[PDB]
Amino acid sequence: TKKESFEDVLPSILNTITTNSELTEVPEVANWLKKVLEYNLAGGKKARGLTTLFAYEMLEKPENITEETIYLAKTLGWCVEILQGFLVMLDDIMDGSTTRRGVPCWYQLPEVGLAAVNDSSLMFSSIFYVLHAHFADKKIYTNLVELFNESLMHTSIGQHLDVTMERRQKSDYSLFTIERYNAIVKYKTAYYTYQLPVCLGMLLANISDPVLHQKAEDMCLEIGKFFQIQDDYIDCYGDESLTGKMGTDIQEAKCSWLAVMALQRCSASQKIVFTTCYGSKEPAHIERIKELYKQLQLPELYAQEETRMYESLIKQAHGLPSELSPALFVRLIHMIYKRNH
Amino acid sequence: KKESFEDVLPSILNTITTNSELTEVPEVANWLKKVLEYNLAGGKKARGLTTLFAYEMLEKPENITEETIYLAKTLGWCVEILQGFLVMLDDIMDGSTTRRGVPCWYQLPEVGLAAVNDSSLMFSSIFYVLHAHFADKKIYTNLVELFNESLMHTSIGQHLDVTMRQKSDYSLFTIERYNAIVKYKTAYYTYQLPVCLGMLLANISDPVLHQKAEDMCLEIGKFFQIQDDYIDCYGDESLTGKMGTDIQEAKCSWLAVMALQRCSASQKIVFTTCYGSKEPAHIERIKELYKQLQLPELYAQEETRMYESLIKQAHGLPSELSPALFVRLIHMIYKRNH
Numbered sequence: 001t002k003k004e005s006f007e008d009v010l011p012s013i014l015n016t017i018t019t020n021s022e023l024t025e026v027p028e029v030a031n032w033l034k035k036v037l038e039y040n041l042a043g044g045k046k047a048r049g050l051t052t053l054f055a056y057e058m059l060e061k062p063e064n065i066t067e068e069t070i071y072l073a074k075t076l077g078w079c080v081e082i083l084q085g086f087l088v089m090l091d092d093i094m095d096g097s098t099t100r101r102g103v104p105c106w107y108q109l110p111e112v113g114l115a116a117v118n119d120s121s122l123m124f125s126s127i128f129y130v131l132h133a134h135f136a137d138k139k140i141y142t143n144l145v146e147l148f149n150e151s152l153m154h155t156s157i158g159q160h161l162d163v164t165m166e167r168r169q170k171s172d173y174s175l176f177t178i179e180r181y182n183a184i185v186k187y188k189t190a191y192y193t194y195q196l197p198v199c200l201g202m203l204l205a206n207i208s209d210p211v212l213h214q215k216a217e218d219m220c221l222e223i224g225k226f227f228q229i230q231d232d233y234i235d236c237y238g239d240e241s242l243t244g245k246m247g248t249d250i251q252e253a254k255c256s257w258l259a260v261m262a263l264q265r266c267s268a269s270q271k272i273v274f275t276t277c278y279g280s281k282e283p284a285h286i287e288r289i290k291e292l293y294k295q296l297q298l299p300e301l302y303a304q305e306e307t308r309m310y311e312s313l314i315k316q317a318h319g320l321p322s323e324l325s326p327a328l329f330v331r332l333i334h335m336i337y338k339r340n341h
Numbered sequence: 342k343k344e345s346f347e348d349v350l351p352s353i354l355n356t357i358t359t360n361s362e363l364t365e366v367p368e369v370a371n372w373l374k375k376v377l378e379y380n381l382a383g384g385k386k387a388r389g390l391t392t393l394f395a396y397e398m399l400e401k402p403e404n405i406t407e408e409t410i411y412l413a414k415t416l417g418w419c420v421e422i423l424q425g426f427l428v429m430l431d432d433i434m435d436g437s438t439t440r441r442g443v444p445c446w447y448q449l450p451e452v453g454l455a456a457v458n459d460s461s462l463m464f465s466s467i468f469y470v471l472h473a474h475f476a477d478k479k480i481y482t483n484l485v486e487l488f489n490e491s492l493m494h495t496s497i498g499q500h501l502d503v504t505m506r507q508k509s510d511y512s513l514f515t516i517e518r519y520n521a522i523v524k525y526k527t528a529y530y531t532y533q534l535p536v537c538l539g540m541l542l543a544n545i546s547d548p549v550l551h552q553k554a555e556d557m558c559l560e561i562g563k564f565f566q567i568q569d570d571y572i573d574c575y576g577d578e579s580l581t582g583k584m585g586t587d588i589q590e591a592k593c594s595w596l597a598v599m600a601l602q603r604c605s606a607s608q609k610i611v612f613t614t615c616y617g618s619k620e621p622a623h624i625e626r627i628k629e630l631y632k633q634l635q636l637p638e639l640y641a642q643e644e645t646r647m648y649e650s651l652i653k654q655a656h657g658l659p660s661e662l663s664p665a666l667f668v669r670l671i672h673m674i675y676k677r678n679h
């Protein structure tokens with residue numbers, strides 16, 4: 001399977017990180033970073049790294065694909081996985097999270113705490129040593145480095161929208177609109193989750209035409225909105241033993257798809273219940289919100305919107321130039337439709 | 342000079358917005374502007390100025406133009422933005438309260454731990470500035486790499502700095518550990534980076550000259566961090582802009598390493614009893630010990646011996662690395678009190 005094949009290269013990636021940096025001189029640190037990386041990359045689906053490799057394989061002419069290019073595609077994919085692990089290490093701090101991939105969040109470990117913020121920088125900086133080690137002498141080098149820095153800017157833009165204390169004042173949820181939601185998810189998720197791995201695949205396949213990149217980017221951004229709606233749903237409704245994480249969107253007062261849809265449907269008296277109980281860690285409050293979501297039929301709306309968006313994404317995919325592989329995108333869509341984690 | 346450096350700031354802030362996706366999201370562009378202004382305000386701009394001075398003294402006067410001076414300042418501001426980023430995070434890890442005479446960014450009620458996201462916004466900004474001014478230039482990739490390398494070096498050092506003595510075991514508080522901490526956490530980004538950037542802008546690529554420069558820079562940087570450690574304990578907050586935390590955070594400071602060198606058996610038990618505690622009486626008790634051990638006197642003497650050694654080294658550099666630049670840099674910091 002593609003997953004074990006992708007995972008097979010991880011130990012070699014970790015050595016590359018060391019050997020190509022000053023880490024060679026400070027083994028206390030090189031050994032620590034190994035622990036950081038193994039913990040924060042462990043488990044999960046590897047979906048972003050896979051999407052990188054799948055894109056490359058689907059977009060390149062099969063006659064131009066070599067074992068070396070496959071290793072390079074996996075390497076780019078692992079760089080997205082590292083970015084992911086960095087992003088979620090900080091996100092977990094910001095979101096008051098307790099567990100991820102079925103264990104304590106990195107920052108919750110007693111030996112780590114707030115020094116996680118330095119572990120994050122060590123992870124992020126690893127990326128550029130991988131990129132330099134494999135690509136410095138190639139024409140795509142500066143496209144790669146810029147793409148990963150752009151991804152950091154995009155994601156942080158979206159994270160600011162997400163966590164900003166200005167998103168709500170007390171009982172004022174006037175900013176919980178779809179305009180705000182669309183901005184949040186476009187920036188915090190859609191870019192790094194889809195646009196980045198696909199663009200990386202494209203660059204590796206020597207596709208440079210700005211029109212094709214723009215077309216692929218618009219497709220990606222649509223898929224990533226869809227993907228975050230599913231993330232938000234799962235926060236509320238997912239099975240912890242499958243997702244590996246306790247949901248916190250309700251207690252943290254997030255402008256999640258569910259909150260936005262709930263406000264679409266609240267009666268005047270329901271709106272008061274929402275504003276009273278949303279954003280609180282008391283279990284009775286949290287439960288009251290979930291009951292309200294149920295009364296408002298948000299589970300049925302999700303199922304129907306997931307399908308409508310699904311059908312819309314598939315049609316968009318079929319209308320892409322063949323140079324972008326409609327089939328790749330159809331398959332990416334198919335892989336996440338109906339997911340429960 | 343400083344104000345001629347500071348005049349360039351409005352164009353940097355403008356570039357950061359317009360060169361990015363920030364143009365579509367004015368809520369975030371306005372926030373980033375506040376983040377930058379607050380975290381770059383005041384201070385000495387020392388690292389930015391080193392960059393500028395390094396270029397001006399390394400390049401032949403016949404090659405310096407108004408446009409290359411602007412580029413040198415721009416690169417200096419990139420270093421200032423890196424500094425801002427690094428200390429934003431450091432202040433979280435060190436439990437600091439103030440910096441530059443105001444609350445540390447993370448202490449602000451509306452920021453908190455979301456400061457970690459503001460740090461990413463700052464770090465990422467650097468690369469838009471480098472792209473705007475340098476993308477079509479040969480040195481571009483070298484500049485991008487130098488910044489990413491600075492992040493790795495600093496984080497390596499920060500790791501050694503923050504990593505969790507055991508209890509009353511201060512066996513690891515040695516000069517070997519100190520030397521590694523400060524080489525990586527300070528000396529690289531504070532001196533090697535700005536000087537390397539000046540060298541690149543002056544088209545100086547000879548690896549031997551880069552090596553000699555680096556070696557000088559690493560010596561200066563250790564020195565600078567010793568002074569920083571001393572200031573944490575003895576500096577006047579109305580000048581430094583910051584409340585000291587090394588004692589209460591149990592840091593492997595120069596002072597602590599030197600204290601251990603001198604402690605009698607009973608002094609050692611006092612040190613292990615009182616170091617690393619937020620209790621005011623415990624902190625003052627460490628300070629009373631430092632005084633008893635004549636650490637202020639030792640610092641004054643060691644600052645002078647290291648200064649003399651630094652100057653001797655600078656005078657012995659190749660002509661093409663500007664002994665005078667280094668003499669100048671060392672004189673700007675010797676005897677500093679913030």
Ligand SMILES: CCC[n+]1ccccc1CC(P(=O)(O)O)P(=O)(O)O
Pocket residue numbers: 087088091095097155159188189193227228231235
């Ligand atoms: C699906 C990617 C979502 N995402 C984007 C940016 C940063 C972090 C995450 C992780 C998500 P999660 O994994 O549920 O904690 P979020 O906190 O709900 O947005």
Ligand SMILES: CCC[n+]1ccccc1CC(P(=O)(O)O)P(=O)(O)O
Pocket residue numbers: 427428431432435437495499526527531565566569570573
């Ligand atoms: C002189 C640069 C010292 N430095 C290096 C790396 C990261 C942060 C700092 C800031 C220092 P400070 O300004 O005293 O908090 P440190 O925490 O004593 O080291």
Ligand SMILES: [Mg+2]
Pocket residue numbers: 091092095097
């Ligand atoms: Mg989260």
Ligand SMILES: [Mg+2]
Pocket residue numbers: 091095162
């Ligand atoms: Mg989040």
Ligand SMILES: [Mg+2]
Pocket residue numbers: 231232235
């Ligand atoms: Mg979520």
Ligand SMILES: [Mg+2]
Pocket residue numbers: 431432435437
């Ligand atoms: Mg500090």
Ligand SMILES: [Mg+2]
Pocket residue numbers: 431435502
């Ligand atoms: Mg520190």
Ligand SMILES: [Mg+2]
Pocket residue numbers: 569570573
């Ligand atoms: Mg200090």
